[PDB]
Design a protein around this ligand. Sequence first.
Ligand SMILES: *C[C@@](*)(O)[C@H](CCCNC(N)=[NH2+])NC(=O)[C@@H]1CCCN1C(=O)[C@H](N)Cc1ccccc1
Lengths: 259, 36
Amino acid sequence: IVEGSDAEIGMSPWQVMLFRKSPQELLCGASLISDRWVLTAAHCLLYPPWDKNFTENDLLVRIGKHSRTRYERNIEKISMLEKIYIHPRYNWRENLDRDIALMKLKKPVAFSDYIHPVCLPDRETAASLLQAGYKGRVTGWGNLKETWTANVGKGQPSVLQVVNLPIVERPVCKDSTRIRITDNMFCAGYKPDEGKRGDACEGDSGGPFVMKSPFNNRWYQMGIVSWGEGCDRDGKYGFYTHVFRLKKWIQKVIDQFGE
Amino acid sequence: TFGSGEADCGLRPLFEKKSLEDKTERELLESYIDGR
Ligand SMILES: *C[C@@](*)(O)[C@H](CCCNC(N)=[NH2+])NC(=O)[C@@H]1CCCN1C(=O)[C@H](N)Cc1ccccc1
């Protein structure tokens, strides 16, 4: 996360750390949507361009974490995976369209103060709330700056990083990039004349863009960190997988089999 | 049916359960249309 700040403990109890077994590596964020189901970006697991193909047992999921690096002994839970389901029409070749994957944990987690599921939005809540200018929140352990090029500062946070940013309108999203935008994507971030800054970055993919409903006051996951072009650049916007447009597929794999 | 345990979703133990606000939380609320 660029231009964000340190998270309070327990403020994103849905945040999940996708963690590679060997070599031990942070790869992405994810979110707890249920005691057995974790949601993430499909490109975190499968992206053939960069020779990328993780299978169910190359990965750990660490839930309840705050620190990027220390084992938090009676707080975090390390879980193993049963199944990975990537959207069958995820488009890895062109624009990362339908950047979504589900992970079925091998046994269920119990909720604690630190571990608690986020809601997925319904028709009325996605409509109500996802309007340009409305603010959401992105959390992750990802890059603090652009590290592929020489830069000043730490690249890597020690604690989960929080940023709150606005949805931008499609006209503007579509002319900040020459990558083909889709109905399954939204962009968010500050305009250059808005004074404020901040963005996701590499390492942040899979983390939730969440929003607090003023009605019931439950946090809902509205997007997944997907793609971007640099991090915090002027006139550029972060792009997010649109969770409500893909809820049919989520529902259909989650409910497929009984418990 | 559900694959789940969740259904108290989106309410966060150290904060809504405890009737507490996080430190930058009123901001997102303030954007939803404006305030008041
Ligand atoms: C996998 C995620 O960690 C990462 C998140 C980047 C978020 N950036 C900002 N500024 N909000 N996503 C990626 O890095 C994806 C996967 C493939 C490369 N990629 C990109 O974002 C490129 N920067 C742009 C791109 C290339 C090809 C197709 C779509 C987008």
